[PDB]
Amino acid sequence: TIPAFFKGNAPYIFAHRGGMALRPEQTQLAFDYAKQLGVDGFETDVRLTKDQQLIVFHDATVDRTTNGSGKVSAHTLAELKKLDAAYHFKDINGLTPYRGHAHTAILTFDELLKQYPDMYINVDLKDAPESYEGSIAPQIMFDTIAENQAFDRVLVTSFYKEQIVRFNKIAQGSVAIGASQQEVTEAFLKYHLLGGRYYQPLAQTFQMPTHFKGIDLTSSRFIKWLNDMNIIPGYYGVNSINLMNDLYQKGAHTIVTDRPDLAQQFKQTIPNKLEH
Ligand SMILES: O=P([O-])(O)O
Ligand SMILES: O=P([O-])(O)O
Ligand SMILES: [Cl-]
């Protein structure tokens, strides 16, 4: 029943929102470029539309990344598909080189799965649990994974524990899920009480920044401790090749980067036989 999300013996390199430092976030321009640069998959976010479709999108509103305004939840997919989601992407010249160009439209999560069937998906359920969108997004996420037979290549997580809990109740463990902040806290407590003999029953992925408020989270013993706890350590915001190799060597299993160019460099360094 447990999905074989992790295959081979190499950590997965994910492009942050498709590689948002180099191309307009969440667009085909970004996903195509990151895939060409050799990433193993895409980290991304989903928001629910007025007509209850999951789009690949970060903010609650379209203002920051498009020429439109207002909540995703107040727009139909049809209305959202008319927008230019590269409208505000600026290069270091200050130009907006992709505004008005092809392949700049908002993607649905369904067409992300169909269009990139070889990519692993690391997806964040963004709508809040107390919102209407949050109450139905986990089911629609599962329905989307199921109709595309993508159970073994999608990792579903959320900032909100209740969204993970809602999704996992529907998926019944058939899709890999992220470890919530509260779940890891409970794990540290059970560890201290029971001694080193404790370990989480089901392996879940705990994605961390490499640092928080001056605290370095990349210690070799911490990563080993989490692996000992049956917690899958992962990191985001990894934007140097030395840090990528360091986390690979220490036992991290997922790595989200804003610079998908590093993926190609990382993979030429590892043997081909470690990949599946
Ligand atoms: O997709 P993120 O930026 O919320 O991690
Ligand atoms: O605002 P986020 O990207 O930290 O969720
Ligand atoms: Cl609009």
17 CB less than 6 Å from ligand 1? yes
C-alpha distances in Å from residue 221, one per residue of 83, 177, 218, 225, 226: 47, 24, 9, 6, 9
From the CA of 82, the nearest ligand is: 3
C-alpha distances in Å from residue 173, one per residue of 5, 144, 192: 12, 16, 27
Tokens matching residue 163: 């969204």
Give the residue ranges of DSSP H helices in 116-209.
132-147, 161-171, 181-194
Q: Confirm whether 96 is domain-assigned.
A: no
The structure tokens 């529907």 sit at: 170
We report the CATH number of the domain holding residue 210 as: 3.20.20.190
Q: Which atom of ligand 1 is nearest to the CA of 256?
A: 5
What resolution (Å)? 2.1
Ligand 3 midpoint to CA 79 (Å): 7
Q: What is the DSSP letter of 155?
A: E
Handedness of CA 63, 89, 101, 13 (dihedral sign): negative
Q: Concatenated DSSP letters for 4-36? A: ----SSS-EEEEETTTTTTS-TTSHHHHHHHHH
128: CB partners within 8 A, 6+ apart: 134, 160
Pocket test for ligand 1, best of 47, 55, 58, 121 (most atoms within 8 A of CB): 58
Dist. CA 40–CA 120, nearest whole Å: 6
Handedness of CA 211, 215, 216, 219 (dihedral sign): negative
Q: Which atom of ligand 1 is nearest to the CA of 45?
A: 1
Ligand 1 midpoint to CA 45 (Å): 7
Q: Confirm whether 258 is domain-assigned.
A: yes
Provide the domain limits for residue 121: 12-62+109-269
Secondary element (H or E) of residue 46: strand 41-48
Experimental determination technique = X-ray
Handedness of CA 173, 158, 134, 120 (dihedral sign): negative
Dist. CA 170–CA 135, nearest whole Å: 12
Question: CB count, 10 Å around CB of 121?
Answer: 22
Of 112, 141, 114, 110, whose CA–CA distance to 125 is shortest? 141
45 CB less than 6 Å from ligand 1? yes
| 122-157: b (≥16 Cβ within 10 Å) or e | bbbbbbbbeeebbeebbebbbebbeebebbebbbbb
From the CA of 69, the nearest ligand is: 3
The structure tokens 């000992």 sit at: 228
- Give the Cα-Cα-Cα angle 104, 107, 111 (nearest 5 degrees): 130
25 CB less than 6 Å from ligand 1? no
Of 111, 98, 80, whose CA–CA distance to 20 is shortest? 98
Q: Confirm whether 183 is domain-assigned.
A: yes
C-alpha distances in Å from residue 93, one per residue of 11, 72, 97: 35, 30, 10
Ligand 3 midpoint to CA 74 (Å): 10
Q: Concatenated DSSP letters for 202-222? A: S-EEEEEESEETTEE---HHH
Tokens matching residue 80: 């959202």
- Length, in residues, of the chain: 276
Of 266, 261, 268, whose CA–CA distance to 243 is shortest? 266
Q: Confirm whether 181 is domain-assigned.
A: yes
Dist. CA 206–CA 236, nearest whole Å: 10
84 CB less than 6 Å from ligand 1? no
From the CA of 157, the nearest ligand is: 1
Domains contained in the chain, number? 1
- List the beta bridge partners of residue 234: 207, 254
Give yes or no for a contact between 28 and 85, defined as CB atoms under 8 angstroms apart: no
Q: Confirm whether 79 is domain-assigned.
A: no
Amino acid of residue 55: I
Question: CB count, 10 Å around CB of 77?
Answer: 16
Q: Concatenated DSSP letters for 75-95? A: S-HHHHHTS-TTTT---TTS-
Phi-psi region of 81 (alpha: psi -120 to 50; beta: other; left: phi over 0): alpha
Q: Confirm whether 103 is domain-assigned.
A: no
Ligand 3 midpoint to CA 55 (Å): 16
Q: Confirm whether 243 is domain-assigned.
A: yes
Give yes or no for a contact between 121 and 154, defined as CB atoms under 8 angstroms apart: yes
124 CB less than 6 Å from ligand 1? yes
Q: Confirm whether 24 is domain-assigned.
A: yes
